[PDB]
Design a protein around this ligand. Structure first.
Ligand SMILES: [Zn+2]
Lengths: 173, 217
């Protein structure tokens, strides 16, 4: 997936392989092997072939791929881009209002009289009133380096769809 | 050799006790009057005259002329130690608040002292300032070829720590210095707090500084 770094429904190598299987008609032979009672020793192998055919897909999305899905997904992509962009703009404005409208080196320091520092004296704050408006006592800190044996597990896959023609073929299969 | 503590005490004696009959015979203690003015901050610069010092200790004048920087420091320290006896803007506000915290001597020092040279010393030309006169008070004549604009020279830098709310001070002597970064106070070091220091130009002592070049007539 460094080289197959491919977008939502661009045909991956696996998609092209499945489409080649469809065009060659070997899917019909796999169906014959699974449906026929005469050669059931190959049923385990054919199960393995089918399990390797379906890897990106999940059944709930696959069963709903009607013939008119392409136009729907065009409009859905435009809507998703619109909401993503609006969300990013909102996040940008929250960050912009968090910091001040003066430049970074515009100095000035404050004392919060009612708030003890880690010592006995009151805390001296340097990042401006706009950072004090929503004050947090970990603004300047970095995260901790959790060790390797303590780190949480992560997802081995992300849901790129296969190409729509391949999705139609897989639904029919 | 010298016992600079005894020298400081003798300097205190001179400053306390000298009088010169100014204003037609009023017997004014000139340095006591100027000490009152310094203590009240109505005066900032004190030009002590070594001709006046010669009238009760020529040996002290010789020691000053031979080791002038040391005695400049000693005279300044004696004056600062004597200002409360005669104590009848922004940095003043900061010194007031630091006194409130008490309730950095060079920062709290808000005056300056200079030696007006003795008349026995002939005014040299620039060429006659030999290497034997290094560290010694000399009088030099010349034409002022060029003068720079007045610039602020840091005397005592003042920092504030973000994590522990403590002020730290850094006296400056050399023409260059290392600005402090991480907080040295033990409440930061022992707690490994990662607290850093921000220079406070408002609450740090600057001084007017000017570079010029004299030239021979
Ligand atoms: Zn600190």
């Amino acid at each position: 997936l460094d080289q197959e770094k491919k977008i939502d429904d661009d045909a991956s190598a696996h998609d092209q392989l499945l489409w080649a299987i469809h065009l060659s008609g070997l899917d019909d032979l796999l169906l014959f092997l699974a449906s026929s009672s005469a050669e059931e020793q190959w049923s385990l192998h054919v199960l393995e072939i089918v399990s390797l055919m379906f890897r990106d897909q999940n059944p709930e999305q696959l069963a709903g791929v009607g013939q008119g899905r392409l136009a729907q997904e065009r409009s859905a992509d435009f809507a998703e881009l619109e909401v993503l962009r609006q969300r990013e703009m909102a996040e940008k404005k929250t960050r912009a209002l968090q910091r001040g409208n003066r430049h970074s080196r515009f100095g000035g320091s404050y004392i919060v009289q009612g708030l003890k520092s880690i010592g006995e004296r009151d805390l001296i704050f340097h990042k401006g009133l706009h950072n004090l408006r929503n004050y947090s006592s970990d603004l300047g800190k970095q995260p901790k380096k959790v060790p390797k044996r303590r780190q949480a597990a992560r997802e081995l896959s992300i849901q790129r769809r296969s190409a729509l023609n391949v999705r139609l073929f897989l639904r029919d299969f | 050799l010298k016992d600079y503590a005894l020298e400081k005490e003798k300097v205190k004696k001179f400053l306390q006790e000298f009088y010169q009959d100014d204003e037609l015979g009023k017997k004014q203690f000139k340095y006591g009057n100027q000490l009152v003015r310094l203590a009240h901050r109505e005066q900032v610069a004190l030009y002590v005259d070594l001709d006046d010092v010669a009238e009760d200790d020529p040996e002290l004048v010789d020691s000053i002329c031979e080791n002038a920087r040391r005695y400049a420091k000693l005279f300044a320290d004696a004056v600062q130690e004597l200002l409360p006896q005669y104590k009848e803007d922004v940095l003043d506000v900061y010194i007031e608040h630091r006194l409130m915290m008490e309730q950095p001597a060079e920062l709290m020092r808000r005056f300056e002292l200079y030696f007006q040279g003795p008349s026995s010393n002939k005014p040299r030309v620039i060429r006659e300032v030999r290497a034997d006169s290094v560290g010694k008070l000399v009088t030099v004549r010349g034409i002022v070829t060029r003068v720079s604009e007045v610039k602020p020279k840091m005397v005592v830098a003042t920092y504030t720590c973000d994590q522990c709310g403590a002020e730290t001070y850094q006296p400056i002597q050399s023409p260059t210095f290392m600005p402090l970064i991480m907080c040295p106070s033990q409440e930061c070091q022992t707690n490994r707090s990662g607290g850093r220091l921000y220079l406070q130009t408002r609450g740090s002592r600057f001084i007017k500084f000017q570079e010029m070049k004299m030239q021979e007539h």
